[PDB]
Amino acid sequence: VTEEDIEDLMKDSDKNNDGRIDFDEFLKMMEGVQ
């Protein structure tokens, strides 16, 4: 249970590969499930 699991979840829930996130990304990383 280490930071590679955390690394796969930011890479799963992201798509366009903006490897840094702004408050947009925050609204959909919370509830951008359909």
């Binding site: 930071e3 955390i6 990304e25």
Partner: protein
């Protein structure tokens, strides 16, 4: 009916506050306590 409590929430998470989230901070949200 705007951005106010998701605002205080997105700033309460953020360490030093230039305004963004990075992959290095995001694990520390899902862990840090004390």
């Amino acid at each position: 009916k705007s951005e106010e409590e998701l605002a205080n929430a997105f700033r309460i998470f953020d360490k030093n506050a230039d305004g963004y989230i990075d992959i290095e901070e995001l694990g520390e949200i899902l862990r840090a306590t004390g």
